[PDB]
Design a protein around this ligand. Structure first.
Ligand SMILES: [Mg+2]
Ligand SMILES: [Mg+2]
Ligand SMILES: [Mg+2]
Ligand SMILES: [Mg+2]
Ligand SMILES: [Mg+2]
Ligand SMILES: [Mg+2]
Ligand SMILES: [Mg+2]
Ligand SMILES: [Mg+2]
Ligand SMILES: [Mg+2]
Ligand SMILES: [Mg+2]
Ligand SMILES: [Mg+2]
Ligand SMILES: [Mg+2]
Ligand SMILES: [Mg+2]
Ligand SMILES: [Mg+2]
Ligand SMILES: [Mg+2]
Ligand SMILES: [Mg+2]
Ligand SMILES: [Mg+2]
Ligand SMILES: [Mg+2]
Ligand SMILES: [Mg+2]
Ligand SMILES: [Mg+2]
Ligand SMILES: [Mg+2]
Ligand SMILES: [Mg+2]
Ligand SMILES: [Mg+2]
Ligand SMILES: [Mg+2]
Ligand SMILES: [Mg+2]
Ligand SMILES: [Mg+2]
Ligand SMILES: [Mg+2]
Ligand SMILES: [Mg+2]
Ligand SMILES: [Mg+2]
Ligand SMILES: [Mg+2]
Ligand SMILES: [Mg+2]
Ligand SMILES: [Mg+2]
Ligand SMILES: [Mg+2]
Ligand SMILES: [Mg+2]
Ligand SMILES: [Mg+2]
Ligand SMILES: [Mg+2]
Ligand SMILES: [Mg+2]
Ligand SMILES: [Mg+2]
Ligand SMILES: [Mg+2]
Ligand SMILES: [Mg+2]
Ligand SMILES: [Mg+2]
Ligand SMILES: [Mg+2]
Ligand SMILES: [Mg+2]
Ligand SMILES: [Mg+2]
Lengths: 134, 158, 262
RNA sequence: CGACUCUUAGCGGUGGAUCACUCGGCUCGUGCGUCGAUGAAGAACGCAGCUAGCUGCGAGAAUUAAUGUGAAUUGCAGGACACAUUGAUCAUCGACACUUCGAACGCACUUGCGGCCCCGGGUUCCUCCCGGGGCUACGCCUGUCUGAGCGUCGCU
RNA sequence: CCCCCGGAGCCCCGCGGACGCUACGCCGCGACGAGUAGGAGGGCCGCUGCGGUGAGCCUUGAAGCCUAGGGCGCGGGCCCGGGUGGAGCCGCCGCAGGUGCAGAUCUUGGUGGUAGUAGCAAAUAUUCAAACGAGAACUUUGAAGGCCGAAGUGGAGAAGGG
RNA sequence: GCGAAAGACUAAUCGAACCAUCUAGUAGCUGGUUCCCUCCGAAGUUUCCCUCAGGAUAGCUGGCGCUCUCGCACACGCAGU
RNA sequence: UACCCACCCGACCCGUCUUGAAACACGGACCAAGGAGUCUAACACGUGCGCGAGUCGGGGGCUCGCACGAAAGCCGCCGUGGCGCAAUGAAGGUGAAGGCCGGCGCGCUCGCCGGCCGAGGUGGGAUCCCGAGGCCUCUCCAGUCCGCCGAGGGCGCACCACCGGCCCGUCUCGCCCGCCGCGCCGGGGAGGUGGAGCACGAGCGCACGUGUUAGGACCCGAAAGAUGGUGAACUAUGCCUGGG
RNA sequence: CGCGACCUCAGAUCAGACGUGGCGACCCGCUGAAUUUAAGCAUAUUAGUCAGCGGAGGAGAAGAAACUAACCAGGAUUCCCUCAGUAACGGCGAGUGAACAGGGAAGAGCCCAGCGCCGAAUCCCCGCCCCGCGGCGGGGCGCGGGACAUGUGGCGUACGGAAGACCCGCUCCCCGGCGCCGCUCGUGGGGGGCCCAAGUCCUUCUGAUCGAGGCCCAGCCCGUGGACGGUGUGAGGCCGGUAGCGGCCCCCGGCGCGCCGGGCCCGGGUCUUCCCGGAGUCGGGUUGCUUGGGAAUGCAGCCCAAAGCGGGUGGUAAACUCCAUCUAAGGCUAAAUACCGGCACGAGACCGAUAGUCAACAAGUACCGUAAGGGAAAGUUGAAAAGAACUUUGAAGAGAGAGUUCAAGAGGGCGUGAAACCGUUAAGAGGUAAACGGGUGGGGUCCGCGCAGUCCGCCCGGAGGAUUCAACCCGGCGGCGGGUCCGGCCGUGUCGGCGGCCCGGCGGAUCUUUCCCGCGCGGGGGACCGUCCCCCGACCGGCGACCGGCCGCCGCCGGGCGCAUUUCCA
């Protein structure tokens, strides 16, 4: 159960706080898990997806083991746009198809100044909770 | 149109009850709004009788009611010069001063004086400063208590 | 709302105009102009007797009534007949007024709790709850009341010393203090007899809570258990005592198909 | 079997019920209790690369600086940038800004008329004239200056 | 003697009892059952909401919908046969309703018959040829016949219109 | 208000406008009033009414009941007789 | 059983107001959807449950960020009060108790003093108890057990009818008084009558049905009335300024 | 024929302030109906309500008695319960219709004027410095202004106060800074940011799963987290989240020590001297509204208009007369208390797009009226536009193929997709309009079958064929029933223990202050009765409350029994 009044739990109110959330927040929402290799290496469960991050489809029509790189992110349609993830239209003009973060797994994070410090700070929070539970 | 045995009934709904109806779905949230005051006030005035100041034994008025007794408003004035308490001091010492009571009898005077005499004796005057002089009750009679009196100070039972 | 369909300013052009004598909306080059307003019968408009706020929503019971409602719920928390007959999956349970050590008030982790509910063979009620999880039939779905499930065993404890934390995530379990029992939760649906788990600490406190019988409650002001209307509740024993059987006219059970007249 | 018609059925529409959803209501609670001549509430007009509407904003106009945030933004373009960078975007907002009416304030509401101060050009105060900035609405309080009175006196 | 039913062998059986005994179940008798208004009772008659409960049902297809698909109740309705539909649904025990339509020149939206019906009648007026055009009585150009007929169907303005 | 005067006209409105609210105005008066089955089952009669289109009370009806009898070889009562 | 068709008999179109409707009365083209006895307060009776000369409920308190919680639990609260536990009188106020016995006062159907019993009786009164007598039982008698029948007799609730009684009001009448005090003081009798009275209790709380009102009030359904505002763009007048 | 004070009064675009509109639920003044009700009706009521109007704030008003009372008295306000739907009012009728006491929420008290005391002890505005400056303030210094003697400061205000005499005891608050130390309840104050478990494991459905079995305890993991939403179907585990004195970083809040600058000689108790109340006010007469106030409750206009052991009040006029109780004419104030407007949230036995607000969307929008004002309709493709490329017919609208799609019988007003209604295909009918009731008959579409429906079930006899038994004992296990209540444990009624009684409590206005503690009372202890526990002994219901042995019977398992038995099959 939730408890804290000063949080919602309302079929509608957080259905709403979806396709009205600003791009600020949608980052956090549009997060996908990391593959076991990284999840081991780094002590972080899931990350916000980013433009040039390498990704494996896990669910969907065209699930597979092919590591495609992300191309862009509709944070508006609120859905990502990957590499050989694509379909041929009537004219031959290939169009990519939408997939969530949530239905995808990160196989190689594209690292940075700003993204490293998150990976540190998430892994530091994880271990602080386990050291606090200890 | 009445039919065969009832009362008359002058129910008074010819005006406009409808507009000015108060329903009470505050009642329980109010209960709690209140709780938090009782609560907060006590934690704020930490060592001090939570209920409020000391208040006098007093007789109910009209003829039926005679035999009862109450917490009155405040102890009289005549009452204090007798107990040896200055009226403006009493107000700081958690002693409730009405200054508006005609004291008519020695019975209910001394009865009510004994409450002050009683109060003095079981009162720990917590001293102005920590390094303070006279009349404040000693660091033993000081350590022993942090005790708020829950419920009405020296409750008046008939 | 008090204003429901009642914000219109419609006169009613009554009689001489065919129409219908409703109050019909004024002027306009809209469509909503000569429609009808303030009829229960009409669009916009409003209902019978606007559901008002000062309906007597809540209700009332005598203390005594609702103390010996708890009695009757508790008394039938024994008697595996009634408890089972709520689908309370008590078959491998050792005994029915199921008392447990007072170590239990002090578990602080759901894994401990769960290991208790195995070792008292009481999974299979929670198990059962745990299968009965579905989407509610109706319109409640789109109102914060989508899922539903069974009730699981009630668990009772004189003092939260960490316990209520432990038995929380486990679906179906409700905790109740002994000092603060509740008829809604012991006897859900107004049916009798839920599976309960007294912890010794609590189980002692039941007679002091609300009485033995030739002794006061000594925790409620004045309260003693209800007397029975009759003691020997089984009558089948009664009906074949020799006292009774001796003093009875002999039967009449030829039966007696009616006679066709010739 | 001729055509029409009726009934029923087999299918085609028309209509938009029913059902199923639901970023909206409604009701009930809790917290706080938010205006203005430094110029409100209210209106007008304008503002996007492609924009009519809603919405957001104000000639510094689909925002301003800053701090988090931290890579998008996107209907299509177009872009900087160096994504080792206040560094895209969003939220916050605290830094600066506030077209025209309006209690609307120079006087009126035509959108015209002025007055009085300054600074450009003109002049070289020569006055306009052309340019620029500040004032100028009513009431009333404390104070100041200038007064009036065969009011009450004083000294002449 | 005149003996034991764990055995008389049983139409009587009292030693233990239906299949039948939802103890508000079932069974036999008799008797009786015109109805407006109204009452009353009975409704595993019907709608929507919740507490219980049904190891209910459900992407192996729900609600609705559709059915000259088998049935059942006296009947409210109910149950079964198929197709389509595409997401949720029901049974019992309770509780809760804004609760069941043929009517109110009832409300809203839609649709017929009428009906391919009334009708496209005020100012005498058109015709030819060519162009353009997929397509021309209806546009345009030419030619011809006509009208308004300077108190105009002529040429300019106001208010209004924008 | 306005009327050489006709109750003329006051923006399709005049024996006196239109707009919103009081506003669910009131109505002894029109109309309607939504699922089955079972049982019993009227009155249009009485007196008072500012009563005659309505009420008041008399009736008749249902429901709810109760006190008993005894059809359990072993009844008193009642009655459009 | 349903669809079409066929036949034979039957047969007026519903709703409604209505002494009487197929009406040469009114509503009603057809279909979908919406649609009219609701809530609250107050009574009243009926019923369900708790406790019972009590019983409650709030409003308050004590125990929550509620997830469930705006719940549940608990409180010399618990009774500060309502309702009931007693009425009657306009009001001052009075207030439900009688029987019997003995004794004393002349028992004067008047006054007082000691004891006994305590809600008086009659008739009906479900009815519980007693029961004379049957009525068997393989024989004659004897006899305990066991039931059935049972004339006749006793207690008799509830209720009904009656007769008695006591409180208050009022009347009548008539007696004796106590005496912190004086009787325009207080007090005591008898008979009658008025009382929504007592005469060994039934309420309280909470359900639900019905009903009756107050409530918009079953829905729909006026001509009006009031309060505030907008209009001379039409027309009526006046005026100002233009044109024919 | 001047100059000068003051008083009154002007003018200043003077120096500095400020007022005005809106919002308007709640809040305060006033004003103010009529529908309506009374079966009419005007009295009454609606109802001091709506409109009108005026006015405020985070709440508003009121408030420290000219009160209550009749007690053995209480003691500002407001609020809730209660009084109590009561006292009374009324063509005493419809209606109306309060209060006093008690309990409870909260609860705080105070200030003026005058009498006087005190070199105006005061106040305002300038100039120079010292600190302070995103609510303009302290500190100092200035013959820099000015009010104020028609009166500014302190004490003081009625509950007494002043002033004196001697009775007693003894000295810390305030404010401007300027630092610093303890982040100071949801369970680290407010706000923001940032952060913290566990499967996309097997297999299998499916277009896609989030579904179904399984997976080291309902499977694996997590579970202070299994709310919810997202995620091409129902997902604790994928993701956001959730839980969780979980973490960290800013900011903001508030409170604690130091330093400093300033301010302040502020007590307590006794005996005397005197000193006191707010005028066109109270009151009365009158009229007008109001309530319930009355032979006057409230408020008004006018008229008359006071006193000082007075005045008001002490609720049917009045005189006399006795008693109580306040003290007006000046003023402030938290708290509970109210909140259909605002911001910000949380929820629901709610409605679910002709409902729900007019408004799920370009909603107060389109449109109408000159204007006040009036004021709508309208949600849904799919999961993804993957939204028909291309050939072809067609001037073009439209088609046919094709293509996409799990599905286009989801095609841009697209989920579903009813009826009226209309579209055509098939069957059958058809002069008394159709339509209906009863009864059959023919035909169809379908539905049961039968390529015999001979329906099954016992038992038995016969003939074939096949396993191990049944009957019996013996070993074991498990029931059942019986009793000896045998032995023990259990509880009902009785008796005994007076044994718990103080090692058994709680109730009782029972009793003792012979007791103890604290101030006759309160608390505590000690005696008493009613209640509830131990010991053991006796009787009895010996009770579903067992448990042990003995028994009797049954069942299962394992042994024995090989076949005239006991099964299976045809
Ligand atoms: Mg208090
Ligand atoms: Mg509506
Ligand atoms: Mg449904
Ligand atoms: Mg529609
Ligand atoms: Mg619809
Ligand atoms: Mg002069
Ligand atoms: Mg019948
Ligand atoms: Mg409803
Ligand atoms: Mg309907
Ligand atoms: Mg002509
Ligand atoms: Mg022209
Ligand atoms: Mg005429
Ligand atoms: Mg009629
Ligand atoms: Mg006729
Ligand atoms: Mg008619
Ligand atoms: Mg009462
Ligand atoms: Mg009138
Ligand atoms: Mg204002
Ligand atoms: Mg009438
Ligand atoms: Mg009337
Ligand atoms: Mg009238
Ligand atoms: Mg009147
Ligand atoms: Mg009035
Ligand atoms: Mg009134
Ligand atoms: Mg108003
Ligand atoms: Mg008071
Ligand atoms: Mg989930
Ligand atoms: Mg989901
Ligand atoms: Mg997670
Ligand atoms: Mg006065
Ligand atoms: Mg009045
Ligand atoms: Mg005052
Ligand atoms: Mg004030
Ligand atoms: Mg105030
Ligand atoms: Mg719609
Ligand atoms: Mg709508
Ligand atoms: Mg649709
Ligand atoms: Mg639809
Ligand atoms: Mg489909
Ligand atoms: Mg579809
Ligand atoms: Mg869908
Ligand atoms: Mg469709
Ligand atoms: Mg057809
Ligand atoms: Mg044909």
């Amino acid at each position: 159960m939730k408890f804290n009044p000063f949080v919602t739990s309302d079929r509608s109110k957080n259905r709403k706080r979806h396709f009205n959330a600003p791009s600020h927040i949608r980052r956090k929402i549009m997060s996908s898990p990391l593959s076991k290799e990284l999840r081991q290496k780094y002590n972080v469960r899931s990350m916000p997806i980013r433009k040039d991050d390498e990704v494996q489809v896990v669910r969907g029509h065209y699930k597979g083991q092919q590591i495609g790189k992300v191309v862009q992110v509709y944070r508006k349609k609120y859905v990502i746009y990957i590499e050989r993830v694509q379909r041929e239209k009537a004219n031959g003009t290939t169009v990519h198809v939408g997939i969530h973060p949530s239905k995808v797994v990160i196989t190689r994070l594209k690292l940075d100044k700003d993204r490293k410090k998150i990976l540190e700070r998430k892994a530091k929070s994880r271990q602080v909770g386990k050291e606090k539970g200890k | 149109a009445p039919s065969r045995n009832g009362m008359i009934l002058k129910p008074h709904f010819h005006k406009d009850w409808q507009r000015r109806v108060a329903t009470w779905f505050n009642q329980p949230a109010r209960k709690i709004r209140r709780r938090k005051a009782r609560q907060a006030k006590a934690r704020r005035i930490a060592p001090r009788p939570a209920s409020g100041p000391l208040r006098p034994v007093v007789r109910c008025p009209t003829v039926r009611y005679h035999t009862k007794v109450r917490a009155g408003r405040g102890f009289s004035l005549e009452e204090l010069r007798v107990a040896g308490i200055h009226k403006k001091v009493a107000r700081t010492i958690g002693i409730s001063v009405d200054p508006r009571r005609r004291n008519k009898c020695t019975e209910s005077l001394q009865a009510n004086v004994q409450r002050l005499k009683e109060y003095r004796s079981k009162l720990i005057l917590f001293p102005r400063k920590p390094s303070a002089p006279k009349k404040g009750d000693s660091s033993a009679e000081e350590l022993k208590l942090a005790t708020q009196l829950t419920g009405p100070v020296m409750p008046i039972r008939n | 709302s008090e204003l429901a369909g009642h914000q219109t300013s419609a006169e009613s052009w009554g009689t001489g105009r065919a129409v219908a004598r409703i109050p019909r909306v004024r002027g306009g080059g809209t469509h909503r102009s000569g429609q009808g307003a303030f009829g229960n019968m009409c669009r916009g408009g409003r209902m019978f007797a606007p559901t008002k706020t000062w309906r007597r929503w809540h209700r009332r019971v005598n203390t005594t009534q609702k103390r010996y409602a708890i009695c009757s719920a508790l008394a039938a928390s024994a008697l595996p007949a009634l408890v089972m007959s709520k689908g309370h999956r008590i078959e491998e349970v050792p005994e029915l007024p199921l008392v447990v050590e007072d170590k239990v008030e002090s578990y602080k982790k759901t894994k401990e709790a769960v290991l208790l509910l195995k070792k008292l063979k009481a999974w299979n009620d929670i198990k059962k709850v745990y299968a009965s999880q579905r989407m509610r039939a109706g319109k409640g779905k789109m109102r914060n009341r989508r899922r539903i499930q069974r009730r699981g065993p009630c668990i009772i404890y004189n003092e939260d010393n960490g316990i209520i934390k432990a038995f929380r995530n486990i679906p179906g379990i409700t905790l109740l203090n002994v000092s603060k029992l509740n008829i809604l939760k012991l006897a859900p649906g107004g049916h009798v007899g839920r599976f309960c788990i007294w912890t010794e600490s609590a189980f002692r406190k039941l007679d002091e809570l609300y009485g033995t019988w030739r002794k006061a409650a000594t925790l409620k002001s004045n309260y003693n258990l209800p007397m029975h209307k009759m003691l020997n509740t089984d009558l089948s024993r009664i009906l074949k005592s020799p006292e009774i059987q001796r003093a009875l006219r002999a039967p009449r059970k030829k039966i007696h198909r009616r006679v066709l007249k010739k």
